[PDB]
Every structure is written in structure tokens, then in C-alpha cells.
Coordinates of C-alpha atoms (C1' of nucleotides) in Angstrom, one line a residue:
Chain A
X8 CA -0.3 -0.2 0.0
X9 CA 1.2 3.4 -1.0
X10 CA 2.1 6.3 1.2
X11 CA 3.5 9.6 0.9
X12 CA 5.7 12.0 3.4
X13 CA 7.2 15.5 2.2
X14 CA 9.9 16.6 4.6
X15 CA 11.8 20.4 3.4
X16 CA 14.9 20.5 2.0
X17 CA 18.0 22.7 0.0
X18 CA 17.0 21.7 -2.9
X19 CA 12.4 21.8 -1.8
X20 CA 10.4 20.0 0.1
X21 CA 11.4 16.3 -1.2
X22 CA 8.2 13.7 -1.2
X23 CA 8.5 10.4 -1.2
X24 CA 6.3 7.7 -2.0
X25 CA 6.4 4.1 -0.6
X26 CA 4.8 0.7 1.2
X27 CA 5.9 -1.2 3.8
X28 CA 8.2 -3.6 0.7
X29 CA 10.8 -0.5 0.6
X30 CA 10.7 2.8 -1.0
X31 CA 8.9 3.8 -4.4
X32 CA 10.1 7.3 -5.7
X33 CA 12.4 10.8 -4.9
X34 CA 10.2 13.6 -5.2
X35 CA 10.6 16.8 -5.4
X36 CA 8.1 19.7 -5.2
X37 CA 9.3 23.0 -3.9
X38 CA 6.4 3.0 6.9
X39 CA 10.9 1.5 7.8
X40 CA 12.3 2.9 4.0
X41 CA 10.2 5.9 4.2
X42 CA 12.3 5.8 9.0
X43 CA 16.1 4.9 6.4
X44 CA 15.5 7.6 3.9
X45 CA 14.1 10.7 5.9
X46 CA 17.0 10.1 8.1
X47 CA 19.7 9.5 5.2
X48 CA 18.8 11.9 3.0
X49 CA 18.6 14.6 6.0
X50 CA 21.6 12.3 6.8
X51 CA 23.0 13.0 3.5
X52 CA 22.2 17.0 3.5
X53 CA 23.4 18.2 7.2
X54 CA 25.5 16.4 8.5
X55 CA 27.2 14.7 4.9
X56 CA 30.0 13.5 6.6
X57 CA 28.6 10.2 7.8
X58 CA 26.9 9.4 5.5
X59 CA 28.0 6.0 5.5
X60 CA 26.8 5.5 8.8
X61 CA 22.9 5.4 8.2
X62 CA 20.8 2.2 5.9
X63 CA 20.1 2.8 2.2
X64 CA 16.6 1.8 1.5
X65 CA 14.6 -1.9 -0.4
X66 CA 14.3 0.0 -3.8
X67 CA 9.9 -1.3 -3.8
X68 CA 9.9 0.9 -7.3
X69 CA 8.7 -1.5 -10.7
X70 CA 12.4 -0.9 -12.3
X71 CA 13.5 -2.9 -9.9
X72 CA 12.1 -6.5 -9.8
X73 CA 12.5 -6.4 -13.9
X74 CA 16.1 -7.7 -15.1
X75 CA 17.3 -4.8 -17.4
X76 CA 20.4 -2.2 -18.0
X77 CA 19.1 0.5 -16.3
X78 CA 17.8 -2.5 -13.4
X79 CA 22.5 -3.0 -13.4
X80 CA 23.2 0.7 -14.2
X81 CA 21.2 2.0 -11.1
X82 CA 22.2 -1.1 -9.7
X83 CA 26.4 -0.7 -10.2
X84 CA 26.0 3.5 -9.9
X85 CA 25.0 3.3 -6.5
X86 CA 26.8 0.4 -5.5
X87 CA 30.0 1.8 -7.1
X88 CA 30.0 6.1 -7.3
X89 CA 29.8 7.4 -3.6
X90 CA 29.8 10.9 -1.4
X91 CA 32.5 13.6 -4.3
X92 CA 32.7 11.0 -7.0
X93 CA 32.2 11.3 -10.2
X94 CA 32.0 8.6 -13.4
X95 CA 31.0 9.5 -17.1
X96 CA 28.6 8.1 -18.4
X97 CA 30.9 6.1 -21.0
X98 CA 32.7 4.9 -17.7
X99 CA 28.7 3.7 -16.6
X100 CA 27.8 2.5 -19.2
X101 CA 31.4 0.3 -19.5
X102 CA 30.1 -1.3 -14.9
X103 CA 26.7 -2.1 -16.2
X104 CA 28.0 -4.3 -19.5
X105 CA 28.1 -2.2 -22.5
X106 CA 30.9 0.3 -22.8
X107 CA 29.1 1.6 -26.1
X108 CA 25.5 2.2 -24.3
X109 CA 26.0 5.8 -22.2
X110 CA 23.7 7.0 -24.5
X111 CA 21.3 4.9 -23.2
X112 CA 22.8 6.4 -19.5
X113 CA 20.8 9.0 -20.5
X114 CA 17.1 7.9 -19.9
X115 CA 18.0 5.2 -17.3
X116 CA 19.1 8.8 -15.1
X117 CA 16.8 11.0 -16.9
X118 CA 14.1 7.6 -15.8
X119 CA 15.6 7.4 -12.5
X120 CA 12.4 7.0 -9.8
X121 CA 15.2 7.9 -6.4
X122 CA 17.5 10.8 -7.0
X123 CA 20.2 12.0 -4.9
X124 CA 19.9 8.3 -3.0
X125 CA 21.1 6.9 -6.1
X126 CA 23.6 9.4 -7.4
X127 CA 22.3 10.9 -10.5
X128 CA 24.0 14.0 -10.1
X129 CA 27.3 12.2 -10.2
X130 CA 27.3 11.0 -13.4
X131 CA 28.3 13.6 -15.7
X132 CA 29.2 13.9 -20.0
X133 CA 32.9 13.2 -20.6
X134 CA 34.6 16.4 -21.8
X135 CA 34.2 16.6 -18.6
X136 CA 30.7 18.6 -18.3
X137 CA 28.5 19.1 -16.4
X138 CA 26.2 17.0 -18.1
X139 CA 22.4 18.1 -18.1
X140 CA 19.9 17.0 -15.4
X141 CA 16.7 15.6 -14.8
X142 CA 14.8 17.3 -12.5
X143 CA 16.8 20.8 -13.8
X144 CA 19.9 21.8 -14.5
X145 CA 20.3 24.2 -11.1
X146 CA 20.0 21.4 -8.4
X147 CA 22.6 18.6 -10.4
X148 CA 25.0 21.9 -9.9
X149 CA 23.8 22.6 -6.4
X150 CA 24.9 18.6 -5.6
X151 CA 28.2 18.7 -6.5
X152 CA 29.5 22.1 -5.2
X153 CA 27.5 20.1 -2.4
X154 CA 30.4 17.8 -2.2
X155 CA 32.7 19.5 -2.6
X156 CA 33.4 20.1 -6.2
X157 CA 34.5 23.3 -7.3
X158 CA 32.6 25.4 -9.9
Chain B
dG27 C1' 8.3 -5.9 -33.5
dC28 C1' 9.3 -0.7 -35.9
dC29 C1' 10.7 3.2 -35.6
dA30 C1' 12.3 8.5 -32.7
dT31 C1' 14.6 9.6 -28.6
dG32 C1' 17.6 11.6 -25.7
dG33 C1' 21.0 12.9 -19.7
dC34 C1' 26.5 10.3 -25.5
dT35 C1' 31.2 10.2 -28.6
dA36 C1' 35.2 11.1 -30.3
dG37 C1' 35.7 13.4 -34.9
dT38 C1' 35.6 16.3 -38.3
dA39 C1' 36.4 21.2 -40.7
Chain C
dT21 C1' 34.1 26.1 -30.8
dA22 C1' 29.2 24.2 -34.5
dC23 C1' 28.7 20.2 -36.0
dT24 C1' 27.9 15.4 -37.7
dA25 C1' 27.7 10.9 -37.8
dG26 C1' 27.7 5.4 -34.7
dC27 C1' 26.0 3.7 -31.2
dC28 C1' 21.5 2.0 -28.0
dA29 C1' 18.0 0.1 -24.5
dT30 C1' 13.7 1.9 -24.5
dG31 C1' 9.2 3.4 -24.8
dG32 C1' 5.0 4.3 -27.6
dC33 C1' 1.6 2.2 -30.7

DNA sequence: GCCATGGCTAGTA
DNA sequence: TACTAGCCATGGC
């Protein structure tokens, strides 16, 4: 049974949907998974220094159920890339499987139903360029700046 | 299944 | 820089 909850943040009211089974989707407005998520974020923003101490919630969304490239990607990304780090679309294609399929990672990230958590903002253009971003480019930038990046 | 698309890239003039 | 032509896993239809 899908449940939703809002929470203030530097990015604006973040609304987290999800049931007892796992986190469904982190959306930006401007049960056990929610209690962990609403703590992981509240941590990430206001106490990034220690984000490893917090539990990554169970992800329920229909994207994590059916096996695909997308799933491998989102996974192969959440695992590999951590706070302050960054990985190129191609560097992430190589990880999930097809090193040529960097482009399809775009929509993968576009489609990512759990931004921040699953760091989509850490995926940038190969040219070093920050790249575009689903919830509006300003965010991707504020986040990386947040994660100690120079701009 | 066929085809348009988009958050990619390396190359080229 | 500006622009182009492979490469690719999706989502409509």
C-alpha cells in the first residue's frame, strides 16, 4: 500500500512515496523504508560528513524488479559511486555492461525514480562537462558543489 | 516488433 | 567551437 510523505530540504519539499516493501520514488516538489530514507537524506544534506553510518533503504519501484540494463546501471552506480566522486556516462556504461551504451544511461538517469539516493547527479559528460539533469540542471550543480566540487 | 528519441561521444572542418 | 554521424536501451504505438 503506497504511502507518501514530504520533508523540507535545501532543494525544497522532497516527497518520498513508498510502502512497507521498499522506497517507491523520491520526487522534488519545491513504514521502515521511509524512516531510513527520511534519515539518509536528512543526513546527506545536514551531516554529509557521516553518510556511511546510515542504511540505504529497500527499493520497491517496478524498475528494480524486472532485470534490465537500467537496473544493472542504477545498481552498478549506487554501489560504485559515493559522495564527492563522479563517473562519466561511458564510464558507467562499461560498468553495467555495454561500454557503448553510454547514451541509454541518459534515459536511465532520466528515468531514475530515486535521485540523490541513487546519485544521478554524480554522472557527468565525458568531456568533464557537468551535463544536463532531469529535475532541472540547477540541482545537479548545487549537489556537486555541495559534495565539495569546484565550480 | 518498427521507429523516434535523448542526460553521449570521438571526430572533423 | 559547431556540427555530424555511430551506438543504444527504452517507450509509444
